[PDB]
Design a protein around this ligand. Structure first.
Ligand SMILES: [Mg+2]
Ligand SMILES: [Mg+2]
Ligand SMILES: [Mg+2]
Ligand SMILES: [Mg+2]
Ligand SMILES: [Mg+2]
Ligand SMILES: [Mg+2]
Ligand SMILES: [Mg+2]
Ligand SMILES: [Mg+2]
Ligand SMILES: [Mg+2]
Ligand SMILES: [Mg+2]
Ligand SMILES: [Mg+2]
Ligand SMILES: [Mg+2]
Ligand SMILES: [Mg+2]
Ligand SMILES: [Mg+2]
Ligand SMILES: [Mg+2]
Ligand SMILES: [Mg+2]
Ligand SMILES: [Mg+2]
Ligand SMILES: [Mg+2]
Ligand SMILES: [Mg+2]
Ligand SMILES: [Mg+2]
Ligand SMILES: [Mg+2]
Ligand SMILES: [Mg+2]
Ligand SMILES: [Mg+2]
Ligand SMILES: [Mg+2]
Ligand SMILES: [Mg+2]
Ligand SMILES: [Mg+2]
Ligand SMILES: [Mg+2]
Ligand SMILES: [Mg+2]
Ligand SMILES: [Mg+2]
Ligand SMILES: [Mg+2]
Ligand SMILES: [Mg+2]
Ligand SMILES: [Mg+2]
Ligand SMILES: [Mg+2]
Ligand SMILES: [Zn+2]
Lengths: 85, 119, 60, 50, 101
RNA sequence: AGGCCAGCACCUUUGCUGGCUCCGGUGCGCUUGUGACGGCCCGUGAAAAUCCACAGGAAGGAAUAGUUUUCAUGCCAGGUCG
RNA sequence: UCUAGUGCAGAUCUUGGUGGUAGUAGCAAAUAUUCAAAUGAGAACUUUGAAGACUGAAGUGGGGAAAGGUUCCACGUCAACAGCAGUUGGACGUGGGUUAGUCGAUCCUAAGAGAUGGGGAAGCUCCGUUUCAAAGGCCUGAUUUUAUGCAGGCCACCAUCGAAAGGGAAUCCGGUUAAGAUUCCGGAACCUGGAUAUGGAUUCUUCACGGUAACGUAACUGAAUGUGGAGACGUCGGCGCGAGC
RNA sequence: GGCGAGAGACCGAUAGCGAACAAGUACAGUGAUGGAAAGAUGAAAAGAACUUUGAAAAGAGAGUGAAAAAGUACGUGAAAUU
RNA sequence: UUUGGGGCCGUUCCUUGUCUAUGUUCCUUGGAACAGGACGUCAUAGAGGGUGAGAAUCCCGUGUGGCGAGGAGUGCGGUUC
RNA sequence: UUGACCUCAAAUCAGGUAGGAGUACCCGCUGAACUUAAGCAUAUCAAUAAGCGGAGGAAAAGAAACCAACCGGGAUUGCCUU
RNA sequence: AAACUUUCAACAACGGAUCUCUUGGUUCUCGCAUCGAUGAAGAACGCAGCGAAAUGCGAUACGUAAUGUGAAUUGCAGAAUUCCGUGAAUCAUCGAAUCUUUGAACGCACAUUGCGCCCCUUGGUAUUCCAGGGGGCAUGCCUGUUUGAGCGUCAUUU
């Protein structure tokens, strides 16, 4: 009975969505994400998980602010406006 | 087509607010037609004109706040400079050029001299 | 029947209808559609005619 | 479930809006390599697991 | 080897006590001033059954000498004690069944 | 109102008009709720939010006028998510 | 002439592809289908009608929780899927559809989880949940520069989370849609919160009368503090009463 | 590692980073994690008007093109197998 | 015996823009000439890419120099207080 | 009585600051085993991997409580060598 | 003798090797130093006239402003004053802004689009109730201010 019949008793979700990573790794009874470690302040990561780091590191998303930092640096973190040459 | 910002910057705050509400009315009147007609790209110009007007209003308000806080320390944290966290925490070129009276005297007495070796 | 911001409540919907269309409101009912938008059924008073102000809004 | 959270409903709405074929003017574009929609999901073939 | 059953009770996961239906801890009244200089009188209101316990408990009501209040106490009932009995607790109390000399 | 009927109308929106809708009985019956009892325990079979009452008597109060809003009536509003 | 990721038949070799087996095994549980018409290119299977049967109310019925997520409904429609078929479909394409003060969530606490204070630990973090803490906010006003401090008094639980079956303020009938309804329409109610005026009641014995009593009434001051009750409770047996059948 | 540049007796789509393409994608797993396949019409769509058989898909003609022995199952088009 | 700090114009560095040669002449093949042949040009440019087939000379560029713009700056080069 | 001092507190007091990401390289803590020894226990693997804390464009180190034994050298780092 | 089996060839199939291509990778070298409470990286939800993705963005939403170039974009539609010009463009540059819900994530919570407190303002005959709008309320630590605590403690009082 440990097979096909026991798979029919599976209707209670151990993990739900995580508010930090949106993944369905948030444990409902432990109150902890299996993937990111929320609510811990540090993001869960391990050097034995190289692919896991590559999946979730910088550059996998939008870089909403960090994209423009190289450009602002190249221009010198200048201030003001251009002046109609 | 749409509005141009250079002919809005000559206007006052109230004129711009009236312009804005009129444009929003036009945008609603266009959204009620978009569902009747198959296509309506005139809505894009109205959206961008609303954006231009709001940008000009924001600029007018921020410059007035700048002039209010002109020439006094402790101005707001959206009118300050953003440069970076580390560069904002770095020592100024005053604090970094500070030296002791001992080192000033030695810099004055024995500076690096300009010497050449021919004769 | 209006499409409504997902952040708007019934107070705001009532006030906005009274503002834009100059109509008194009796009741507001709201649902969130399966497409993620909000739908407002606004029942006006007997003095006003939704049929007469819809074609003024520009749809019928 | 009928008694559901707004979050689950929201993700379901996104999935309903994604459950579309391609528009066919995208196939007429210059330098186009999209033939079909490969991210197509059906409730019978694959579950969302949300 | 494997950790045995008696080693496994100290962690107290499924071996903890089941204290749902217990009325409280059966303690004597705090030894404040009256119980070491004279006596204080209280009254037995009910003798109740305590789950996990063969001995019955007596709910004894005393008065607070410092505040207008009716602090209740849970005694282990002694054989012969009854409802409406006056319990006397303290140094100068009488040698009778139920007293806290 | 709903139900059961009759009659007269029509490309049709289609109806319109009349009536009845009553009086009882039975039970180790079925299901369910409830009441008062009885039996069982070395088993005597949750807690909190919340509401009311009582004790007390602080304080406030009438006569050419006051006090009462656990009586009645009257006005407004009742969000978010499913 | 230089150089090497340089030569395949094997490794139950790797990946991909293809055969024989073979139009073969087989597509046999759940009593059962038949006739006509319509549709259509085409009907054992779609629709309607007629008949014959089954589930047989501890149902193949009507509803729900979890789970699923649009599978609901309509229109169009058959290349693939529905291990025959297919004009049909939980398929394909295009759209429509879920209306609440009274239903739940929301709130309470349960087992339990878990901050703060503090203490451990190189540290990620652990203990512990009222503790060896200087751990707060509640009524009334006084002043009438005036807003709200000082005037007073009171009070000491000491986070928070934890149940869509436990606790819990409050709604019913009729009707309506392709698909929604205790949510919409109509009619008829109720609760909470807040403003409030009139009537009524009471008072010159100031804060009501009657009844021997149990108690009764349209009402008929009441702070702090305190007490009590409800919430709030097993299982089985028979008897009684009611409702629906 | 990040940003910006220049090179190679390197690999050349079963190779080379897992990924030359909507690749950490689709998909699997409660989860930690695991993790693909998939490039080439033609210079130019000029991507086959029109006739005819057929319910239709399609076919046969015609036509475009240098070439349909290039027809969106598209460069060349091996072998097994038919 | 020897001394400090400001300004200005340059230079240094960063970033960026723009300008700066010579055939598309003839015949054959081909759908297309960027192929073949004949005659030439430029070259401090015959690197590379593109264009209907192997293009220095068709296009972008390349090479060589020039003309600007905006900054940072105390490194020095002159002038001024 | 008034006013100081000391130590300790509260404030949505006036101003600031720390956290997290990245982590190739850097400064530290912690810390294996497979493996080699033809077995294995010291040893080796290795003062390595994994785990933890902390930085910058480099970090660290650094102007000798040094090396030496020479006719003495002279912060630190790195290379050739030893 | 046919059929059938086998072998070969031509054509047609199955399949996708080989050949030739390459807006990709890999390695070497060079130069530079720039994330975040002024809210980072990451995540979710949205945004286009007609988009499901990717890419871009945030209710000013495939973008606004500014500057430069100087007439496009393109699959279709539509637009034209935008064309000897403060001006096209899925253009480039980019110094001003916007930047939903979140996240170290900061009012308390979060399996909730939950529950509060303060200031200003508007409305509903309202200091108190309801609602709308705007602005705020984390923790540790430092400097300082103010208010205080303690026979810890000094002096001075009559
Ligand atoms: Mg189970
Ligand atoms: Mg579990
Ligand atoms: Mg609702
Ligand atoms: Mg039953
Ligand atoms: Mg080899
Ligand atoms: Mg082989
Ligand atoms: Mg061999
Ligand atoms: Mg094999
Ligand atoms: Mg057979
Ligand atoms: Mg069989
Ligand atoms: Mg259906
Ligand atoms: Mg079939
Ligand atoms: Mg078929
Ligand atoms: Mg803990
Ligand atoms: Mg709760
Ligand atoms: Mg509940
Ligand atoms: Mg219970
Ligand atoms: Mg319940
Ligand atoms: Mg229904
Ligand atoms: Mg109604
Ligand atoms: Mg009376
Ligand atoms: Mg009780
Ligand atoms: Mg009993
Ligand atoms: Mg050919
Ligand atoms: Mg060909
Ligand atoms: Mg081919
Ligand atoms: Mg062959
Ligand atoms: Mg060994
Ligand atoms: Mg060995
Ligand atoms: Mg061994
Ligand atoms: Mg390590
Ligand atoms: Mg250093
Ligand atoms: Mg040092
Ligand atoms: Zn997570």
């Amino acid at each position: 009975g440990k097979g096909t019949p026991s798979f029919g008793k599976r209707h209670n979700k151990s993990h739900t969505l995580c508010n930090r990573c949106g993944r369905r790794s948030f444990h409902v009874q432990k109150k902890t994400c299996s993937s990111c470690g929320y609510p811990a302040a540090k993001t869960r990561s391990y050097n034995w998980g190289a692919k896991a780091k590559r999946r979730h590191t910088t550059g996998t998303g939008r870089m909403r602010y960090l994209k423009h930092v190289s450009r602002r640096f190249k221009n010198g973190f200048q201030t003001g406006s251009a002046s109609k040459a | 087509a749409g509005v141009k910002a250079y002919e809005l910057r000559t206007k006052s705050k109230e004129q711009l607010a009236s312009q804005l509400v009129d444009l929003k009315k036009e945008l609603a009147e266009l959204k009620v037609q978009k569902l009747s007609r198959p296509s309506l790209p005139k809505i894009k110009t109205v959206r961008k004109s609303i954006a231009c007007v709001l940008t000009v209003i924001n600029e007018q308000q921020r410059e007035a706040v700048r002039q209010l806080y002109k020439g006094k320390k402790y101005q707001p944290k959206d009118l300050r400079a953003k440069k970076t966290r580390a560069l904002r925490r770095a020592l100024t070129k005053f604090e970094a050029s500070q030296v002791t009276e001992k080192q000033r005297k030695k810099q004055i007495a024995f500076p690096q001299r300009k010497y050449a070796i021919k004769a | 029947v209006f499409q409504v911001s997902m952040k708007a409540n019934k107070y705001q919907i009532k006030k906005a209808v009274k503002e834009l269309y100059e109509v008194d409101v009796l009741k507001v009912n709201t649902l969130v559609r399966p497409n993620g938008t909000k739908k407002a059924y606004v029942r006006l008073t007997a003095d006003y005619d939704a049929l007469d102000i819809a074609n003024r809004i520009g749809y019928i | 479930a009928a008694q559901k959270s707004f979050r689950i409903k929201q993700k379901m709405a996104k999935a309903k809006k994604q459950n579309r074929p391609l528009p066919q003017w995208i196939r007429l574009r210059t330098n186009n390599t999209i033939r079909y929609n490969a991210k197509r999901r059906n409730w019978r073939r694959t579950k969302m697991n949300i | 080897g494997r950790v045995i059953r008696n080693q496994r009770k100290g962690a107290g996961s499924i071996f903890t006590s089941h204290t749902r239906l217990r009325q409280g801890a059966a303690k004597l009244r705090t030894l404040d001033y009256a119980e070491r200089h004279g006596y204080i009188r209280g009254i037995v209101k009910q003798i109740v059954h305590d789950s996990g316990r063969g001995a019955p408990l007596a709910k004894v009501v005393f008065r607070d000498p410092y505040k207008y209040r009716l602090r209740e106490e849970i005694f282990i009932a002694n054989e012969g004690v009854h409802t409406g009995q006056f319990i006397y607790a303290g140094k100068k109390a009488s040698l009778n069944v139920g007293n806290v000399l």
